Design a protein around this ligand. Structure first.
Ligand SMILES: [K+]
Ligand SMILES: [Mg+2]
Ligand SMILES: [Mg+2]
Ligand SMILES: [Mg+2]
Ligand SMILES: [Mg+2]
Ligand SMILES: [Mg+2]
Ligand SMILES: [Mg+2]
Ligand SMILES: [Mg+2]
Ligand SMILES: [Mg+2]
Ligand SMILES: [Mg+2]
Ligand SMILES: [Mg+2]
Ligand SMILES: [Mg+2]
Ligand SMILES: [Mg+2]
Ligand SMILES: [Mg+2]
Ligand SMILES: [Mg+2]
Ligand SMILES: [Mg+2]
Ligand SMILES: [Mg+2]
Lengths: 103, 70, 7, 88, 271, 66, 129
RNA sequence: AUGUUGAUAU
RNA sequence: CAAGCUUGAGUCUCGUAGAGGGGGGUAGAAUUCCAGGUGUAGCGGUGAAAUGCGUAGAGAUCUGGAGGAAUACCGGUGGCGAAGGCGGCCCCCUGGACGAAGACUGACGCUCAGGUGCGAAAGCGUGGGGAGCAAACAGGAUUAGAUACCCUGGUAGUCCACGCCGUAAACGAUGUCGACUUGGAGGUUGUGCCGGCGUGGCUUCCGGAGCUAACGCGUUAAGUCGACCGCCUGGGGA
């Protein structure tokens, strides 16, 4: 299993779904012999520029240790979810439990 | 470049600070560069030539410091 | 030309 | 490249020892594993010409080791090409 | 698979076949078959109303499901089949309740693939949803014009529609023509392109191949006598007229759309 | 000049650390040359990748005018 | 690849002399040592010594006279690409006898002088002058 | 901005 | 011919840097076009003009939309690749290089006519795409003329898929492999010992002996040698 750092940022109107989305996405990971190494609801931040005619969004980090197939499934979930205005899935070399500079 | 003219600032000073900001960001140079297309071979040749100038300066610059002219 | 010079 | 595990499995199968990595049989077996693995890659990636230069190095290297093994020991060669399933 | 025939005879020299080995070699599913006898392009007055139609191979009609209204219930693709009645291939699908139907075969669909229709269906090729539920930017085919009517747009081999925008009750579509067209967002569409995109690469190769398809010869107007066509007449090859139809309408540029009823739904003409 | 990343002994520059990354961009948003900051070549490459990742996530701006 | 160790020894000497090196060290071999003897006995090099078992290293100590190197020239003659063998009557006189040709005869490696005396021809390894 | 040419031999 | 050996060559382990390659996705800046608002007589262009665009409302300015192509800064006589070449960011598949510790095989190597593969740009075929640019072409200039340079436009093409072509000042105008032979200053990428002191790889500039017709080359040789290949034999004709 490979380690992925997953940032996604959410439409600030759908800020109240973010708890639900997190537990849904972690269930997809942990229901495939996956793990959640980090999980940081950064909350609503000011965007550096407008995305999708928005000036803020609700960020969520989560480092993960999944198989490839569920992370591909996770990407398609981010793709077909108008809540999630942007996402970035990066490979990391190792698991990352240390807390981010945001917190 | 984006100058806020601060309170209790002469315009002439603020204009000079705008010129500074533009010359720092290198806006005019960027525009003049992009006015016409430079072939990659042309781009590479000038990059090479600039490096050689700076090098052949640096070595020969030290030579001038040592030797007396009179 | 000039049907064949320098002046 | 071949995984640490899959490498080690071939070393055990073809080596006289678990540490016998050098032997012609092990070398040829490892090349055969990776050549066979890459067939799937090049089926998809027909214009991956840079990677294929690596494949054709493996193919070449393997040919040289088999031509070595054959003249060194014809029996060991005959056993190897049978197991790996090579024409020659 | 596009395959050039070998020139063993002059009629074969230029033939290019599109050979799909996936297609069922057997007979079609008989409960979804109907007779469709031929017209000759003749209407109920017995008069030729469309020229150049006649003969060709006898054909059974396959009842294709353009509506795709059996929503909720999954179906598996049994087999692709050749349909004589259209350029696309069709797929016999088996619903989990044991109903069979034909559908237009999308690009990439194969035996064993799962499809489903409805609001709740997944966004994957073969699945049919209301276009309100489909993402903007999606490529779709078999698009309804009125809700419930059945798919009418992008049905031919290799065709599709882009959902370019969604504005309240309407989606905007980019049609194959290049036309930009509003349609109600309750109109269903199936995801993906229509399959058999090689269809256009076929080369019939000889006259007889057109005759097999029930196309009779076109006689040029300029080949005729003045009594027969505006272009008729001349001692030798003469013309000296603006090109027109057999009925005298100009036939190189003159527009013939006249439908103020539907003008509202055209965002941009194909141009 | 001098390189802060060699000094600290950092492994990755990290796109999330905006406070750091802001020191290596101009007022315009542009990545500063290593010749100016005195960063080591190895870290300059990591820093560029970090800034570009941050710009994508809209943690940094691409330019001063959005 | 390395395909003439003798030419390599001659070259190590030639180069080492030009570079005013005191000694030059190559990988050893029987034939190299045999040549080193002839160069020692004829007084071109000063001394040599082999050292090691698995990988022996020959080590020639070079001579210089009045500043200058003693080996004026040293040319491979027979080489892998073209083997030169001479009969006793046709043995080469290097520098009109002031230099040597090292000859591998059936009775071992020796000078062309020694080969003439022994009545043998053989493979002409090198000239030295 | 543009802005041509100078017979043969010696 | 037989048996060895480990130093050439190769295998394994751990790690490192990289625009190496193939596939897919995505981001922001800008151009153009489309629609609309504000606004009014110019805009654009040049050496100077004119063609062109503009009161049917351009240019400018703001909002929204579409689409293609390329990735500013970072960026470096930096890196990677056999060469051609490779530059946003992300993931997937994948090739090579290097280093440190050993262990392993035991000359398995070098070169390579013919052969095979890869091979910029232009070009060709089939199907897509087409913002910007632009052979052809048109008009405007300039001029003795101007089938040009300059200007306004503009088609192939440049982009994608697959196939073909097989050439370039495809250059370091320098074949590959190996050994050896004073130095200096850098760059880049490992590593060991404790900012210093070593030790590997690749690379830029200078320069010593030597070499060279000279220019220059100079441990990345055009020096000193070996192996194999390619090629030259006056200019033209070709
Ligand atoms: K004349
Ligand atoms: Mg390998
Ligand atoms: Mg007709
Ligand atoms: Mg016709
Ligand atoms: Mg007639
Ligand atoms: Mg008439
Ligand atoms: Mg006539
Ligand atoms: Mg006439
Ligand atoms: Mg003149
Ligand atoms: Mg050849
Ligand atoms: Mg091309
Ligand atoms: Mg073409
Ligand atoms: Mg085309
Ligand atoms: Mg022009
Ligand atoms: Mg040539
Ligand atoms: Mg050349
Ligand atoms: Mg030099």
């Amino acid at each position: 299993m490979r380690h992925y750092e997953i940032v996604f940022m959410v439409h600030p109107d759908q800020s109240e779904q973010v708890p639900g989305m997190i537990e849904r996405y972690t269930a997809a990971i942990t229901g495939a012999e996956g793990k959640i190494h980090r999980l940081e609801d950064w909350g609503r931040r000011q965007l550096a520029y407008p995305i999708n005619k928005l000036h803020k969004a609700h960020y969520v980090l989560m480092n993960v240790e999944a198989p490839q197939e569920v992370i591909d499934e996770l990407e398609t979930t981010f793709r077909f979810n108008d809540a999630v205005i942007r996402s970035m899935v990066m490979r990391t070399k190792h698991a990352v439990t240390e807390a981010s500079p945001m917190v | 470049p984006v100058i806020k003219v601060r309170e209790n600032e002469p315009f002439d000073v603020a204009l000079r600070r705008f010129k500074r900001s533009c010359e720092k960001a290198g806006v005019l140079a960027e525009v003049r560069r992009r006015e016409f297309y430079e072939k990659p071979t042309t781009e590479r040749k000038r990059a090479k030539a600039s490096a050689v100038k700076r090098h052949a300066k640096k070595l020969a610059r030290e030579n001038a410091r040592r030797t007396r002219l009179y | 030309x000039x049907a064949x010079x320098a002046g | 490249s071949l995984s640490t595990e899959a490498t080690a499995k071939i070393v055990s199968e073809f080596g006289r020892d678990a540490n016998d990595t050098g032997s012609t049989e092990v070398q040829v077996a490892l090349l055969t594993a990776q050549i066979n693995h890459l067939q799937g890659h090049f089926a998809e990636h027909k214009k991956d010409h840079h990677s294929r230069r690596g494949l054709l190095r493996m193919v070449s290297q393997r040919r040289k080791l088999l031509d070595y093994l054959k003249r060194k020991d014809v029996a060991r060669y005959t056993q190897l090409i049978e197991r790996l399933g090579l024409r020659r | 698979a596009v395959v050039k025939c070998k020139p063993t005879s002059p009629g074969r020299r230029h033939v290019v076949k599109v050979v799909n080995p996936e297609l069922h070699k057997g007979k079609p599913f008989a409960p979804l078959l109907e007779k469709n006898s031929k017209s000759g392009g003749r209407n109920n007055n017995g008069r030729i109303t469309t020229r150049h139609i006649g003969g060709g191979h006898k054909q059974a009609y396959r009842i294709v499901d353009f509506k795709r209204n059996k929503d909720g219930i999954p179906a598996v693709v049994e087999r692709l089949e050749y349909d004589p009645n259209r350029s696309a291939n069709i797929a016999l699908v088996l619903y989990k309740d044991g109903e069979r139907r034909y559908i237009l075969a999308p690009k990439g669909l194969k035996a064993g693939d799962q499809i489903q229709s409805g609001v709740d269906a997944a966004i994957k090729p073969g699945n049919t949803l209301p276009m309100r539920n489909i993402p903007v930017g999606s490529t779709v085919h078999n698009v309804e014009m009125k809700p419930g009517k059945g798919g009418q747009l992008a049905r031919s081999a290799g065709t599709y529609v882009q959902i370019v925008a969604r504005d309240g009750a309407y989606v905007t579509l980019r049609l194959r023509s290049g036309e930009m067209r509003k349609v109600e967002a309750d109109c269903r569409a199936t995801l993906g392109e229509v399959g058999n995109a090689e269809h256009m690469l076929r080369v019939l190769g000889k006259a007889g191949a057109a005759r097999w398809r029930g196309v009779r010869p076109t006689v040029r107007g300029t080949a005729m006598n003045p009594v027969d066509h505006p272009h008729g007449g001349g001692e030798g090859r003469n013309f000296g007229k603006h090109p027109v139809t057999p009925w005298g309408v100009q036939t190189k540029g003159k527009k013939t759309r006249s439908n103020k009823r539907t003008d509202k739904f055209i965002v941009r003409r194909r141009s | 000049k001098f390189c802060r990343f060699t000094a600290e002994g950092v492994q990755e520059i990290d796109y999330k650390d905006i406070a750091t990354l802001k020191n290596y961009i101009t007022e315009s948003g542009k990545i500063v040359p290593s010749r100016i900051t005195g960063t080591r070549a190895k870290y300059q490459r990591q820093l560029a990748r970090a800034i570009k990742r941050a710009r994508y996530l809209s943690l940094l701006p691409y330019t001063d005018r959005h | 690849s390395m395909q003439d160790p003798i030419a390599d020894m001659l070259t190590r000497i030639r180069n080492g002399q030009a570079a005013n090196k005191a000694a030059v060290t190559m990988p050893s071999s029987k034939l190299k040592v045999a040549i080193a003897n002839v160069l020692k006995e004829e007084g071109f090099i000063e001394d040599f010594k082999v050292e090691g078992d698995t990988k022996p290293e020959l080590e020639l100590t070079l001579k210089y006279f009045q500043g200058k190197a003693v080996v004026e020239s040293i040319q491979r003659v027979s080489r892998p690409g073209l083997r030169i063998y001479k009969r006793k009557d046709e043995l080469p006189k290097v520098m009109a006898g002031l230099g040597i040709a090292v000859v591998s005869t059936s009775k071992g490696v020796m000078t062309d002088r020694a080969a003439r005396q022994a009545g043998l021809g053989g493979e002409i390894i090198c000239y030295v002058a």
